[PDB]
């Protein structure tokens, strides 16, 4: 036990802390995942608190459009939604909590999952409210201009979507569905980049990417089989904005919504409930 990260959380209980870091340069994703085993002599089930952090590249790009008739048409690809999900198919595991649990629209998200000896979990949509738990884990992320929704939740899977909502533009607030979002008149230098809002008008989730912070707890009956597999998916859905310069009537824009869906990096992990170990089994790199 000397070379394992173990926290004593009270009489008869401890937490075994594991981590995995799995990246894909092709998908532009890093999964930095924490897997905390709750070991409690007064709780008849095993529990693994999984905290999903890392990075999902926005994959925003600006390009020329090839072909006759498209010489004054430029393309901006950008992420309408970030996808984060954890799924299992094993009968021996179920999801017993998830955070965030409800839709959250604030720029900052900060929530806590608390555990008390005897199998008691609680969640709160804030950080620093309680010093009452035997163990706690928190999530924290910023999602300026985007909102978080639970797109799917059930005993085997949880999926969150962090979706474009409303943006601050020089002309005022703009809906994420406004076909003229990010479009501007550049030509003088005629670069594809100049047909779209400069980097200082693009919020972090468009310019750079998203740093997820989500939790779900896996539950396993002691006495069922030693291992379970589960998949964690991080990715994005991209929209396209096309901007065409008509020298006599100005800039014209068209949006292709959900242009590239589920561009996701999916990693399959195995939890060994008996040895308190996590292994990477596969991925779609
Ligand atoms: C055209 C295009 C758009 C996005 C790309 O990155 S992906 O989302 O990681 O697949 C790659 C090519
Ligand atoms: C540079 C580039 C990027 C995306 C492309 O696919 S499209 O948007 O469906 O035309 C084609 C070329
Ligand atoms: C919103 C959302 C979240 C995760 C997704 O990937 S999956 O878990 O591999 O299906 C897809 C959509």
Curated annotation (Swiss-Prot):
Gene Ontology biological process terms from the UniProt entry: cytolysis in another organism
Gene Ontology terms for molecular function: toxin activity
InterPro entries, per database record: Bi-component_toxin_staph (IPR003963), Leukocidin/Hemolysin_toxin (IPR016183), Leukocidin/porin_MspA_sf (IPR036435)
UniProt subcellular location: Secreted
Keyword vocabulary terms for this entry: Cytolysis, Hemolysis, Secreted, Signal, Toxin, Virulence
Pfam family, one: Leukocidin
GO CC list: extracellular region
Main location: secreted
Keyword Signal belongs to the record: yes
Function: Part of a bi-component leucotoxin that acts by forming pores in the membrane of the target cells. The activity of LukEv-LukDv to rabbit leukocytes is similar to that of the Panton-Valentine leucocidin (PVL). LukEv-LukDv is hemolytic to rabbit red blood cells although the activity is only 8% of gamma-hemolysin.
Family: Belongs to the aerolysin family.
Assembly and interaction partners: Toxicity requires sequential binding and synergistic association of a class S and a class F component which form heterooligomeric complexes. LukEv (class S) associates with LukDv (class F).
Name of the protein in its database record: Leucotoxin LukEv
Native source organism of the sequence: Staphylococcus aureus (strain NCTC 8325 / PS 47)
Taxonomic classification: Bacteria, Bacillati, Bacillota, Bacilli, Bacillales
């Amino acid at each position: 036990r000397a070379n394992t990260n173990i926290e004593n959380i009270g009489d008869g209980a401890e937490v075994i802390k594991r981590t995995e870091d799995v990246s894909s340069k092709k998908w532009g994703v890093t999964q930095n995942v924490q897997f905390d085993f709750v070991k409690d002599k007064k709780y008849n089930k095993d529990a693994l608190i999984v905290k999903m952090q890392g990075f999902i590249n926005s994959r925003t790009s600006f390009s020329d459009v090839k072909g006759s008739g498209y010489e004054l048409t430029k393309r901006m690809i950008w992420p309408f939604q970030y996808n984060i999900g954890l799924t299992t198919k094993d009968p021996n595991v179920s999801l017993i909590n998830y955070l965030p649990k409800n839709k959250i629209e604030t720029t900052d998200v900060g929530q806590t999952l608390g555990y008390n000896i005897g199998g008691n979990f609680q969640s709160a949509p804030s950080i620093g409210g309680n010093g009452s738990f035997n163990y706690s884990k928190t999530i924290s992320y910023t999602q300026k201009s985007y909102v978080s929704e639970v797109d799917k939740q059930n005993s085997k899977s949880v999926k969150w979507g962090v979706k474009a909502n409303e943006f601050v533009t020089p002309d005022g607030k703009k809906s994420a569905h406004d076909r003229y979002l990010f479009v501007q008149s550049p030509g003088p230098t005629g670069s594809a980049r100049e047909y779209f809002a400069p980097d200082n008008q693009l919020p972090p989730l468009v310019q750079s990417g998203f740093n997820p912070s989500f939790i779900t707890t896996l539950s396993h009956e002691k006495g069922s089989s030693d291992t379970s597999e589960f998949e964690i998916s991080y990715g994005r859905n991209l929209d396209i904005t096309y901007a065409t310069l008509f020298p006599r009537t100005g800039i014209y824009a068209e949006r292709k919504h959900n242009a590239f869906v589920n561009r996701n990096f999916v990693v399959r992990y195995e939890v060994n409930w008996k040895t308190h170990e996590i292994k990477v089994k596969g991925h779609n790199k």
